[PDB]
Swiss-Prot record:
It comes from Homo sapiens (Human). This is Voltage-dependent P/Q-type calcium channel subunit alpha-1A. GO terms for biological process: calcium ion import across plasma membrane; calcium ion transmembrane transport; cellular response to amyloid-beta; modulation of chemical synaptic transmission; positive regulation of cytosolic calcium ion concentration; response to amyloid-beta. Keywords: Calcium, Calcium channel, Calcium transport, Cell membrane, Disease variant, Disulfide bond, Epilepsy, Glycoprotein, Ion channel, Ion transport, Membrane, Metal-binding, Neurodegeneration, Phosphoprotein, Repeat, Spinocerebellar ataxia, Transmembrane, Transmembrane helix, Transport, Voltage-gated channel. II repeats lie at residues 323-567. The chain holds residues 86 to 1982 of 2506 of the full protein. The modification Phosphoserine is found at S600, S624. Changing D1028N: Found in a patient with late onset progressive myoclonus epilepsy; uncertain significance. It catalyses: Ca(2+)(in) = Ca(2+)(out).
Amino acid sequence: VVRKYAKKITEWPPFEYMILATIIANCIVLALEQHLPDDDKTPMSERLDDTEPYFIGIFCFEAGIKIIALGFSYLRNGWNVMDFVVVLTGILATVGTEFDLRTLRAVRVLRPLKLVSGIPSLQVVLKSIMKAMIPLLQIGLLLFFAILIFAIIGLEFYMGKFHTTCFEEGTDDIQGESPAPCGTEEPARTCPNGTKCQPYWEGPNNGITQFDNILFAVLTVFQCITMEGWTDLLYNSNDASGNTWNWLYFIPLIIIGSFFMLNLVLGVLSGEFAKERERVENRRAFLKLRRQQQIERELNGYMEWISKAEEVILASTFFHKKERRMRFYIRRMVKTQAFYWTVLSLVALNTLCVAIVHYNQPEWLSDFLYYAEFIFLGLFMSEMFIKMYGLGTRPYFHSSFNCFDCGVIIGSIFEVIWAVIKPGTSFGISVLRALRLLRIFKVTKYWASLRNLVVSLLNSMKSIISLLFLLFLFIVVFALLGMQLFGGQFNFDEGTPPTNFDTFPAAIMTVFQILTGEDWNEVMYDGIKSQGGVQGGMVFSIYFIVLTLFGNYTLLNVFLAIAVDNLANAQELTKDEQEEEEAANQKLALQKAKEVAEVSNQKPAKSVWEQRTSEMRKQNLLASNPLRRLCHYILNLRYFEMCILMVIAMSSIALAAEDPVQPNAPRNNVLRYFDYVFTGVFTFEMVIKMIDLGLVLHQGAYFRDLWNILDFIVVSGALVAFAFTGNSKGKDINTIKSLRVLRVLRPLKTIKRLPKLKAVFDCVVNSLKNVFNILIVYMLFMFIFAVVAVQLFKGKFFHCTDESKEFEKDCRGKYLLYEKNEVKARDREWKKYEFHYDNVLWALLTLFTVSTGEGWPQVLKHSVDATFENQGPSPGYRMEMSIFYVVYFVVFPFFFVNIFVALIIITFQEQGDKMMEEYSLEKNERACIDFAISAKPLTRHMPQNKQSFQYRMWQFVVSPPFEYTIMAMIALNTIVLMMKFYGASVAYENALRVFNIVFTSLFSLECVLKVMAFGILNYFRDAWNIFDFVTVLGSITDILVTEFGNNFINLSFLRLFRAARLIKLLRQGYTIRILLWTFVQSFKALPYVCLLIAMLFFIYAIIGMQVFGNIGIDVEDEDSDEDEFQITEHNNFRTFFQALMLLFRSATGEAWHNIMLSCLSGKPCDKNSGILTRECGNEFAYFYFVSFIFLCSFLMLNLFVAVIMDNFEYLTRDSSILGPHHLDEYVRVWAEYDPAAWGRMPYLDMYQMLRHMSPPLGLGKKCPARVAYKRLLRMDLPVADDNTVHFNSTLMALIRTALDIKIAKGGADKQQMDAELRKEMMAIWPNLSQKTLDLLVTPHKSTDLTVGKIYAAMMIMEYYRQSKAKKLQAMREEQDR
Ligand SMILES: CCCCCCCCCCCCCCCCCC(=O)OC[C@H](COP(=O)(O)OCCN)OC(=O)CCCCCCCCCCCCCCCCC
Ligand SMILES: CCCCCCCCCC(=O)OC[C@H](COP(=O)([O-])OC[C@H](N)C(=O)O)OC(=O)CCCCCCCCC
Ligand SMILES: CC(C)CCC[C@@H](C)[C@H]1CC[C@H]2[C@@H]3CC=C4C[C@@H](OC(=O)CCC(=O)O)CC[C@]4(C)[C@H]3CC[C@]12C
Ligand SMILES: CC(C)CCC[C@@H](C)[C@H]1CC[C@H]2[C@@H]3CC=C4C[C@@H](OC(=O)CCC(=O)O)CC[C@]4(C)[C@H]3CC[C@]12C
Ligand SMILES: CC(C)CCC[C@@H](C)[C@H]1CC[C@H]2[C@@H]3CC=C4C[C@@H](OC(=O)CCC(=O)O)CC[C@]4(C)[C@H]3CC[C@]12C
Ligand SMILES: CC(C)CCC[C@@H](C)[C@H]1CC[C@H]2[C@@H]3CC=C4C[C@@H](O)CC[C@]4(C)[C@H]3CC[C@]12C
Ligand SMILES: CC(C)CCC[C@@H](C)[C@H]1CC[C@H]2[C@@H]3CC=C4C[C@@H](O)CC[C@]4(C)[C@H]3CC[C@]12C
Ligand SMILES: CC(C)CCC[C@@H](C)[C@H]1CC[C@H]2[C@@H]3CC=C4C[C@@H](O)CC[C@]4(C)[C@H]3CC[C@]12C
Ligand SMILES: CC(C)CCC[C@@H](C)[C@H]1CC[C@H]2[C@@H]3CC=C4C[C@@H](O)CC[C@]4(C)[C@H]3CC[C@]12C
Ligand SMILES: CC(C)CCC[C@@H](C)[C@H]1CC[C@H]2[C@@H]3CC=C4C[C@@H](O)CC[C@]4(C)[C@H]3CC[C@]12C
Ligand SMILES: *[C@@H]1O[C@H](CO)[C@@H](O)[C@H](O)[C@H]1NC(C)=O
Ligand SMILES: [Ca+2]
C-alpha cells in the first residue's frame, strides 16, 4: 500500500547484505536436514525445525518494508513476486496445522533462488542463458510431435504384448527370478519343456515400461529417445514377437528423434551464438580486449628495450661488489636457451618418473622413485631460488608462471609432510608440473591461437564463474526437491539403493547422475516404486522427465556458449594481430626505404563462420618400351576402371556373406573361389600399375602414394595366406586367420577411385588437422588425471565374492550364498574389479569409459568404497572421492568436448564453390537473385468456363471452412487414435472402429471433392495431395482387409497409413516446416558424407565378424553374471546384421564397455566352431571398441557440422534484412491477386501490392504514402504497353532495392552498373537465356515509361497542387489586413 508519502525511509546496503546472509543460512539449514523412513526424526532435525519462524519473520519484515516504501510497484518485478509468494506460502504453512499440509513445505526448495534476486549479476547471466534458450521451443515442438507419432505407432503395434512369461507348469508361479517375455510359436521365445506361457506377467521393469495407454507409450518413447534402456526394449520385443521387424521401429526411432534432434539443436544454438556475437555490446567489449592486447604487446617490446638498456648501465658482502656482479651474471644466465631447455627436460623426467608408478612395482623401484622425487623437488626448489635471486623477488612474484611453480613446490612440500604425518594416501601433486610442457608450443606456429584462447578465457572469467554458480544453484534446488518428494522412502526390502535422496550429498550425487543422463531410468523406476508402484505412483515420473530434459539442453547451452564465444574471440584476435603485424611491416619498410632511396601471397580461405560473421557485421553497421605405353593406355581405359569398381564392390559384398561360426560351412567353400578370383584380378591390376609407374626412384612411382602401399599390403597378404596353406594347415591357423582378416581393406579401395568420396575423406582429414593441438592438450590433461587416479586408487579395487571377508587370506574355501527362497554354497574368490586404477594405462581406459558415460556410477561406488591397499571395500568409507569425478565431468566431457565441437564448427571449410575472386557482390545476393531467376507464380485451376456449377464448388473447396474442417477432423482422428488402451470392452473397440470408418469416409469424400474441383492432373501435380490420396487408399485397404476376415492377416503396416495423418498437420507450422525442409534438403545435398559412416560401420562389422564371430552364446552361468556375459543370442557377432546391430548399440553408448570385456580372450567357443578349448576372443577388443567409439563420434560430429554449416545462412537470418525466405510470401500474394496468374498485374494494384505485406520487402499497412512513393522511384520498373508489370521483373526490382545491389544514385553510372551486373550474371549462369536476362535486368530506353516516372509525375502534380493551394492561402491571409 502506498500510504501517500509519510515518513518513508530507504534501506542501507548492509541491510541487503544481511538479507543475503539470512538466505545463505536458510540454505545451510535446509541442507543440514536428514530424512528417515516412516515417522522417525533425528534429534538435530527437531532443533532445526524451530528456526523456520525466525527466517519467515525476517522475510516478512523485508517484504513489508519493501512494499510499504515502494508503495505498490512491488509485483511488477518477477523476483519480488517470487519472494512474495514464498513468504505467503511459508506463513500459511507455519500458521495453522489443519490437514497437516506438507505440500507447502515443498515450496522451501525455491528459497535458494532468492540469491539470484539479491544479486543482479546472476539476473543478467540468467537473462543471457534464457534469451539463447528461447529459440529451442520450436525444436521442442518437433520433439513432442515425433514422440507422439512414435508413441501412437508403438501403442498400435506393441499393445499388451509384454504380459506373458514362462509360468510354471503345475502352478501359476514364475519359473525363475528373472522373468522375460515369451510366446507360443517359433518366431517368439519358446519356454522350456516344464513351463508354459500364461497370461498377465507384471512386465519389464515392474510394468513401468510398456505400451498400454497413450501415457505409458509417451514415457517409453521418451526414455528410448534419451538412449537409455532402448536395447532392453528391443530384446524384450524380440522375445515377445520375433526379431524380424522390431528394428524398423526402434532404430529409425533413435535416428529420427535423437541424432536429428541433436543436429537441429546444435544448428539453432550455433546460429543464435553467431547472431549474438555481432551485437553492439559484444563488439565493443571485443574491441576493448583487442586494444588492451595491442597495448600489452607494445609495452612488452618497450620493457625489453629498457631492460637491455638498463642492464648495461654497469661500468665481505658490503666491501666486494661480487654480491651484485654474480647476481647480474646469473640473471643473464637465466634467459639463456640452455637454462630453459634443461628445465623442460627435468620436468619431462619428473613426469616419466611419476608415470612409472604401478601396483606391484619392485622394492628397488620404490626406493629409486622415493629418492628421485626428493632430488627433483630439491632441484626445482634450487631453480626457484636462483630465479628469484637473479631476476629479483618482485619480478619473480609478478610473473604468473613463477607463481604457478611456487604453488607446485608448496603442494609437493605439503604432500611430503602429509604423507609423513598420515601415511595411507597420496595425491601425486607433483604431476601438475607436467603442465609446463605446454610451453613447447612457443617454438611452433600454434602458440598464437592457444595464447589468444587462454587470454579470452581469462578475460571472461567472472562470466564463467557466474554460469557455474547458477548451474550449482539449480542442482541444489533440484536436490532439495528430490529430498522433499522421495527422501527416506527408498528403504526397500532388498536394501537402500546407492542413488538415494536421504542425505544432501547423496541427493546432489543422484541429481548430477540424472543430469549426465546415465541410468536415470533406474532412478526413475525406484522413485516410482517408492510411492506404491505402477498402480498409484506414476505421477512422480514428471520430476525425472523435467530434470533430464532441462539438464541435457542447459548443460549443452551453458558450455557450448562458453566454447564458441572464447574460440571465436581467440580466432579474431589471432587474425587481427597477424594482419596488423603485416601492415606494420609494409608501412615500416616503406618509411625506411626513403633513407635508402638514394642508392636504389594468398590469405587462407575464410571459413563459413567468418564469412557470415563479416557479412552480418557489415549489414549491422549499415544501420548506423612397348608394354610401358600399352599398359598406360589400359589403365586409362574406361571399361577397365568400371570393371575394377564392380570387382571391388563384389568383393565387399562377398566379405559380408561368410559364416564366422562354421569354417566348414558350404557357403565358405564357395566363397573361397570368389576370393581366388578377386585376388587374381587385384594381382593383375597391381602388376600393370607397377609396369607403368616403375620402381627405380621415378619420384612418381608406385610406393610414393599411400593408397598404393595399401593395395600392395592387401594383395601380398592374400598371396601369403594362399602360400601358407600350401602344405600342412594345422601347423599355424592363427597365421592364416590374420591374413584372412587383412581382406577387410577392400572397401577402402573406393575412396581414391571415387573423386567425391576422396573429397569427403580429405575434409575429414582437415577436420582432424584443425583440432590437433586441442587434442594434445586434452591428452595431457587426461594423463594428469590418470596419474592422480593411480595415486589415489592403486591396489584398492580388490573385492571378495563373500563380502564379510576383508583380506586375501580369509577369502578361501566355501561360503553360503543366501538367495531368495534358496540357499546355495559357492566359493570365495579374491577378484579385482573390472575397471580399476592400477597403472597409467588402466587409469586411462577407465577414465575414457567414464567420459563416454557408461558405467561411471559403478566406478564412483568402487572409488568411494575403497579402504586401503590389498583390502576389501567398506561401503561409504571415503565419500569425499566424489569430488574427483565431479571435477573430471566438469573438465573433460562438459568443456573439452564442447571445445572440439565449437572449433570444428568455427573452422569449417566450404565444399567446392570454386574460387570466386572474379565475382564482387555475391555475399547475400546469390540466393536472392537466383530465386528471382527461378520464380514461378502459384497456379489455381481457374477455368472460368463453368461458372454455373464448377466454379461454385471450387470456391467451396478452397475456403476457410473447408480447411478448418479438415484440421478439426485431423485433430479428432488423432485423439481417436490416442484413446486406445489395454483392457477395454468390446463396445469400446467397436466404437473406435466405427469412428475410424467415419473419419476415413470423410477423408475419401474430400479426396473425391478435390478431384472434381481441380481435375485429375491438377489433383496429382501436388506432392501433399498424392500423399493424401495414398493415405486414403491405405486406410480403405486396411478396412477391407479387416472386414474380410481370416485369409492372411496382411500384417499391420496398413495401420501405419492410418497413423500417418499427423504429417498433414505440418502444413500450418510455417517455421517448423521450413526448418525441417531446409535440413532435409541439406542432408540430401551431402550423400557421400553419409556414405563414409556406412563404410566405417561396414569395415568394423566385418572385422568383428572375422575376429569375435565364434564366441559361444549357449553358456549361461548359475548367476548368469549379466555384467560380463553380454554376448548373447541378441548381441552376438554371428552374422552381418547382428554385427551391425551391436555396432549401432555401441555407437548409442549403452554398456559398450561390458561388451568389450565380454569379447576378451579366454572365452568358451561355440559347439560348431571346431575348437574344443576355451580359446575364443582376443585382447584386440580394447583397441577395437575404443577406436570404433572415437571414429564414430568424430564422423557423426563432422556430418552434423557439415549440415549446420550448409544451413548456416538460414540459421543466422534476420527479419529486418531481406532473405529468400520472405520471397515466398510475396509470391503467394502476387499469385493470389490474379486468379489466372498469367504473370502480369496492373501497375495501379502494385501500390496495394506493397502495403499488405510486412517490411523489408513490403512497405506495411502503416507506411506513409510519401515513403511508399520514394521507394518506388528507386525500382525504375518499366511498364508494358498494357499498363501491367511482369512478375519476375517486379521481384528483381524488389530484391535489388532492399539489398542495394550495385544501386547507383543516378546518371550514366546506372548503365555501367547494369552492364557490370549483366556480365556477372552471365559469368555465374552461362545457361541463362538472353530473353530471361533482359527480363530480369531490363535494358533501359529513355522512351520507356517506368513506374518511377508515373509516381514521380503525381508527386510533382501533388506538390504543384499543394504549392498552388498554399499560394492562394498565402495571397489571402496576407490580404485580410
Ligand atoms: C517427424 C517425422 C516423423 C516420421 C515418422 C516415421 C515413422 C516410421 C517408423 C517405422 C514404421 C514401421 C514400424 C514397424 C514395427 C513392427 C512391429 C511388429 O511387431 O512388427 C511385426 C508384426 C508381426 O508380428 P505379429 O505378432 O504376427 O503381429 C503383431 C501385430 N500386433 O507385424 C508385421 O507383420 C510387420 C508389419 C510391417 C512393419 C514394417 C512395414 C514397412 C514400413 C517401412 C518400409 C520401408 C521399406 C522396407 C525396408 C525393410 C525391408 C525388410
Ligand atoms: C572427438 C569429438 C567427439 C564429440 C562427440 C559429440 C559431442 C556433441 C554431442 C553432445 O554433446 O550431445 C550429448 C547428448 C546427450 O545424450 P545423453 O546424455 O542422453 O547420452 C546418454 C548416454 N550416452 C548413455 O546412453 O548412457 O547426446 C550424446 O550423448 C551424443 C551422442 C553420441 C555422439 C554422437 C553420435 C555418435 C554415435 C552415432
Ligand atoms: C610422455 C610419455 C611418452 C612417457 C612414456 C610413456 C609412459 C607413461 C608409459 C609407456 C609404457 C608404460 C609402462 C608399460 C608397462 C609397465 C610394466 C609394469 O610392470 C609390471 O606390470 C610388473 C612389474 C614387476 O612386478 O616387476 C610397470 C609399469 C610399466 C613400466 C609402465 C610405466 C608407464 C609407461 C613407461
Ligand atoms: C547393405 C549393402 C552393403 C548390401 C547388403 C549386404 C549384406 C547385408 C547381404 C548381401 C547378401 C546377403 C546374404 C545372401 C544370402 C544368404 C543366405 C541365407 O541362407 C542361409 O540361411 C544360409 C545358407 C545355408 O543354410 O546353407 C542367409 C542369409 C545370407 C547369408 C545373406 C545375409 C546378408 C547378406 C550378406
Ligand atoms: C556444476 C558444478 C559446479 C556443481 C557440482 C556440485 C558439487 C559442488 C557437489 C556435488 C557432489 C558433492 C560432494 C558429494 C559428497 C561429499 C562427501 C561429504 O563429505 C563427507 O565426508 C561426508 C560423509 C558422508 O556423507 O558419509 C560432503 C562433501 C562432498 C565432497 C560433496 C561436496 C560438494 C559436491 C562436490
Ligand atoms: C574423445 C571422446 C570425446 C570420445 C567421444 C565419446 C562420446 C561418445 C561421449 C564423450 C562426450 C560425451 C558427451 C559430451 C556431452 C554430454 C552432454 C551432457 O548433457 C552429458 C554428458 C554428455 C552426454 C556426454 C556423453 C557422450 C559423449 C558424446
Ligand atoms: C560373391 C558375389 C556374387 C556377392 C553375392 C553373394 C551372395 C548373393 C551369394 C554368393 C555365394 C552364395 C552362396 C553359395 C552357396 C550356398 C550353399 C547353399 O547350400 C545355400 C546357399 C549358399 C550359402 C549361397 C547363398 C548366396 C551367396 C552367399
Ligand atoms: C585442472 C587440472 C589442473 C586438474 C587438476 C585438478 C584435480 C586433479 C584435483 C582438483 C581437486 C582435487 C580433489 C580435491 C579433494 C580431494 C579429497 C582428498 O581427500 C582426496 C583427493 C581429492 C578428491 C582431490 C583429487 C584431485 C582433484 C580432483
Ligand atoms: C487433446 C487432448 C484434450 C486429448 C488427449 C487426452 C486423451 C487422448 C488421453 C489423456 C487421458 C487418457 C486416459 C487416461 C486414463 C485412462 C484409464 C485407463 O484404464 C484406460 C485409458 C485411459 C481412458 C486414457 C485414454 C487416453 C486419454 C483419454
Ligand atoms: C592399427 C592397429 C592394428 C595397431 C595397434 C596395435 C595394438 C594396439 C593391437 C592391434 C593388434 C593386437 C594383437 C592382435 C592379436 C593378439 C592375440 C591375442 O591372443 C593376444 C594379444 C594380441 C597379440 C593383440 C595385442 C594388441 C595388438 C598388438
Ligand atoms: C523336453 O522335450 C523333449 C522332446 O522330445 C523330451 O524328450 C523331454 O523329456 C522334455 N522334457 C520334459 C520335462 O518333458
Ligand atoms: Ca546408458
